[PDB]
Design an enzyme around this catalytic site. Structure first.
Site, PDB file in Angstrom:
ATOM      1  N   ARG A 138      -1.023   7.104 -10.510  1.00 37.93           N
ATOM      2  CA  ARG A 138      -2.219   6.297 -10.312  1.00 37.93           C
ATOM      3  C   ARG A 138      -3.155   6.935  -9.296  1.00 37.93           C
ATOM      4  O   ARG A 138      -4.377   6.953  -9.494  1.00 37.93           O
ATOM      5  CB  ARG A 138      -1.845   4.887  -9.873  1.00 37.93           C
ATOM      6  CG  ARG A 138      -3.049   4.043  -9.509  1.00 37.93           C
ATOM      7  CD  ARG A 138      -2.725   3.113  -8.367  1.00 37.93           C
ATOM      8  NE  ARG A 138      -2.560   3.823  -7.104  1.00 37.93           N
ATOM      9  CZ  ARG A 138      -3.540   4.023  -6.230  1.00 37.93           C
ATOM     10  NH1 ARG A 138      -4.758   3.564  -6.486  1.00 37.93           N
ATOM     11  NH2 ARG A 138      -3.301   4.682  -5.104  1.00 37.93           N
TER      12      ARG A 138
ATOM     13  N   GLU B 165     -12.569  -4.762   2.446  1.00 41.04           N
ATOM     14  CA  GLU B 165     -11.177  -5.184   2.350  1.00 41.04           C
ATOM     15  C   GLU B 165     -11.001  -6.484   3.122  1.00 41.04           C
ATOM     16  O   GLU B 165     -11.297  -6.544   4.319  1.00 41.04           O
ATOM     17  CB  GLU B 165     -10.235  -4.101   2.886  1.00 41.04           C
ATOM     18  CG  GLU B 165      -8.779  -4.526   2.941  1.00 41.04           C
ATOM     19  CD  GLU B 165      -8.218  -4.882   1.572  1.00 41.04           C
ATOM     20  OE1 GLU B 165      -8.448  -4.121   0.605  1.00 41.04           O
ATOM     21  OE2 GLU B 165      -7.551  -5.932   1.465  1.00 41.04           O
TER      22      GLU B 165
ATOM     23  N   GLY C 237     -11.995  -4.084  -2.468  1.00 44.42           N
ATOM     24  CA  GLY C 237     -10.586  -4.088  -2.111  1.00 44.42           C
ATOM     25  C   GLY C 237     -10.096  -2.705  -1.733  1.00 44.42           C
ATOM     26  O   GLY C 237      -9.146  -2.192  -2.329  1.00 44.42           O
TER      27      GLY C 237
ATOM     28  N   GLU D 286     -17.419 -11.181  -1.629  1.00 45.26           N
ATOM     29  CA  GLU D 286     -18.354 -12.240  -1.990  1.00 45.26           C
ATOM     30  C   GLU D 286     -19.200 -12.686  -0.803  1.00 45.26           C
ATOM     31  O   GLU D 286     -20.311 -13.190  -1.001  1.00 45.26           O
ATOM     32  CB  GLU D 286     -17.599 -13.434  -2.576  1.00 45.26           C
ATOM     33  CG  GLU D 286     -17.012 -13.180  -3.957  1.00 45.26           C
ATOM     34  CD  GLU D 286     -15.660 -12.494  -3.892  1.00 45.26           C
ATOM     35  OE1 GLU D 286     -15.198 -12.199  -2.767  1.00 45.26           O
ATOM     36  OE2 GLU D 286     -15.060 -12.247  -4.960  1.00 45.26           O
TER      37      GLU D 286
ATOM     38  N   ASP E  80       2.508   5.891  -5.759  1.00 46.03           N
ATOM     39  CA  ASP E  80       2.312   5.998  -7.197  1.00 46.03           C
ATOM     40  C   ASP E  80       1.499   7.249  -7.497  1.00 46.03           C
ATOM     41  O   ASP E  80       0.264   7.196  -7.527  1.00 46.03           O
ATOM     42  CB  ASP E  80       1.610   4.748  -7.729  1.00 46.03           C
ATOM     43  CG  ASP E  80       1.649   4.644  -9.241  1.00 46.03           C
ATOM     44  OD1 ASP E  80       1.610   5.690  -9.920  1.00 46.03           O
ATOM     45  OD2 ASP E  80       1.705   3.506  -9.754  1.00 46.03           O
TER      46      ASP E  80
ATOM     47  N   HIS F 131       0.802  -1.218   0.000  1.00 44.50           N
ATOM     48  CA  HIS F 131       0.000   0.000   0.000  1.00 44.50           C
ATOM     49  C   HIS F 131       0.836   1.270   0.000  1.00 44.50           C
ATOM     50  O   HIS F 131       0.343   2.317  -0.437  1.00 44.50           O
ATOM     51  CB  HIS F 131      -0.964  -0.017   1.183  1.00 44.50           C
ATOM     52  CG  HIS F 131      -1.950  -1.134   1.101  1.00 44.50           C
ATOM     53  ND1 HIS F 131      -3.027  -1.115   0.242  1.00 44.50           N
ATOM     54  CD2 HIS F 131      -2.070  -2.268   1.830  1.00 44.50           C
ATOM     55  CE1 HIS F 131      -3.746  -2.208   0.417  1.00 44.50           C
ATOM     56  NE2 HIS F 131      -3.186  -2.926   1.374  1.00 44.50           N
TER      57      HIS F 131
ATOM     58  N   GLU G 212      -2.881 -11.681 -10.613  1.00 39.24           N
ATOM     59  CA  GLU G 212      -3.322 -11.535  -9.232  1.00 39.24           C
ATOM     60  C   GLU G 212      -4.150 -10.266  -9.056  1.00 39.24           C
ATOM     61  O   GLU G 212      -3.978  -9.507  -8.099  1.00 39.24           O
ATOM     62  CB  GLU G 212      -2.130 -11.556  -8.281  1.00 39.24           C
ATOM     63  CG  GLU G 212      -1.495 -12.924  -8.164  1.00 39.24           C
ATOM     64  CD  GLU G 212      -0.291 -12.925  -7.256  1.00 39.24           C
ATOM     65  OE1 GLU G 212       0.262 -11.832  -7.000  1.00 39.24           O
ATOM     66  OE2 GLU G 212       0.095 -14.019  -6.792  1.00 39.24           O
TER      67      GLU G 212
END
Lengths: 324, 321
Positions: A17, A63, A41, A92, A14, A8, A115
């Protein structure tokens, strides 16, 4: 513990991004103001906080990894825990109070699908998104270009430079290094510049996240075909594969794009390099065509495999199977 | 996999500090090597063997167990030295030489000196093939330790407090989380430092003499010693750095953060938490480099340390916009 810190830290440091996700969200204030958002996530929860800054009434930050406890610290630290609810566990099995108006997620992996969290995003789209709901980003585009890797040339030329540095001739090692550094079947993650790009980059696949059955296409393989013409004469080492994601809103004919192309500012994703077994000499207007398929690994469905079919001008069509 | 074997030797030769130090260490012993015989243990590409021929050796036996020995054979032939340098495949423990040798040269050092090193192969060759008092290149290894305040660690921890000013999102609480995780582990971290990281005069706590029979046995029991140092000034102590140097008889190759960088960098041993120290804060303790109980080639370091009048503690390690 330090692995979760590194993942993280790299994600938020980044700048390209993180600034793109901030703009893409804030530029969708009209679609998010007063609405509900699901963050798939959510990691540290920074995207969930961007949504709240865009005016969201309720944000569900899901998360599964242990960093969700940090996400709750961050959300509470920003005085947002009454609107933004960090919910642990996978998306899920999580239970939301309601279907949501929008889904936000940072899900892209190396080579887009190594991934990645894409399948969890698609599950959340099916389970929790209202019909016609917003997805941020909404699509991903895959690009390919043939490359003459300057870093590889340096690595191969290194053995011919030993004699002038240390007085020992090691040019015989160049042939050895050429076979070893390129004969493997591994996808190499490294960043390149425009000086490595041998022909105009070609878009070979676009992924619309709103599409049902996009997930069954994920198992069947995501890919497409390409053709290009070389800028000039150089040794062709192979191909670079990269992606972009597109954020809706703002302007319908020029929406916000976050790109990982070597022609654009660097990101932590860099590019995925596919090296042929040996260098192939090409000339200006040499025609290169083929097909690229991004596949799940047979052993591990999360591990990216790329099957490359290619043809360089006069030469016969060859095939190479790569894995990450 | 073939790229593993090229990258290890590419890294080795691309390390200018290491390659040039080995080159001079050999070439400056021309008088001792002139007309003499040399055994190169783990000769790899053979570059060291050819340095020995240039120094005047009448014969060099280049022993290499990995497949790269075929490349070394071509290197020797390419340099027109197939009469003087003979590449012999296989491990040095089983290879058969025509004669005992006057000198042994070998690149054997690992990270933290003894992590997956070739030292034991060298010691076996010393026992079996080196003449009495023969030349060893290098001949000794010195181990140093120094307390450190890692500037790179602080830089990483301090990033989280800068997120609010750039993105409007406060993430300062992550600073406590990153400090706990980047330090609470028990792993040796391979990282390079500078003089601005060193909190006290580096202390030599052990020295290895490659000629000594029984050094192999001693290594299995672990090697190290005591140390004491006085801090330069105020700073958060993050732990200790361990590095080595090897001495060529006349000539030192160093991996110190005060000296030009090498591919070995330094081995960093982080405390669980930063400890504030001040000028003249006394730090003392013991460092032991041990073979790991799981894998004898894997390096383990046991550190006992005492800062000021705080209680003596122990930690066991193993290997912005």
């Amino acid at each position: 513990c330090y692995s979760d810190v590194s993942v993280h830290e790299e994600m938020i440091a980044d700048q390209v991004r993180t600034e793109a996700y901030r703009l893409g969200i804030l530029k969708n204030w009209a679609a998010l103001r007063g609405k509900t958002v699901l963050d798939v996530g959510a990691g540290t929860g920074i995207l969930s906080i961007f949504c709240a800054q865009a005016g969201a009434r309720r944000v569900y930050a899901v998360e599964a990894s242990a960093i969700w406890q940090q996400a709750r610290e961050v959300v509470r630290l920003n005085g947002l825990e009454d609107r933004v609810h960090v919910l642990p566990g996978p998306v899920e099995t999580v239970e939301l109070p309601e279907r949501v108006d929008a889904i936000v997620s940072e899900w892209m992996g190396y080579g887009l699908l190594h991934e990645s969290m894409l399948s969890s995003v698609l599950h959340a789209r099916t389970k929790w998104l209202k019909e016609g709901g917003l997805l941020l980003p909404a699509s991903a585009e895959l690009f390919v270009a043939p490359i003459s890797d300057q870093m590889l040339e340096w690595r191969l030329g290194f053995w011919s430079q030993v004699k002038q540095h240390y007085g020992v001739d090691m040019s015989c090692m160049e042939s050895f290094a050429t076979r070893c550094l390129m004969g493997h079947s591994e996808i190499v993650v490294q960043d390149l510049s425009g000086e490595d790009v041998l022909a105009r980059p070609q878009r070979f696949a676009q992924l619309e996240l709103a599409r049902a059955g996009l997930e069954q296409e994920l198992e069947a393989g995501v890919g497409g075909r390409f053709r290009c013409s070389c800028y000039g004469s150089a040794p062709l080492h192979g191909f670079a594969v990269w992606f972009q994601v597109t954020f809706p809103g703002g302007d319908s004919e020029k929406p916000l794009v976050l790109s990982t192309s070597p022609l654009h500012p660097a990101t932590h994703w860099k590019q995925a390099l596919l090296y042929l077994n040996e260098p192939v000499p090409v000339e200006q207007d040499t025609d290169i065509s083929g097909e690229i398929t991004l596949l799940p690994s047979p052993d591990n469905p999360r591990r990216l495999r790329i099957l490359l079919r290619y043809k360089v001008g006069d030469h016969e069509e060859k095939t190479k199977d790569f894995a990450m």
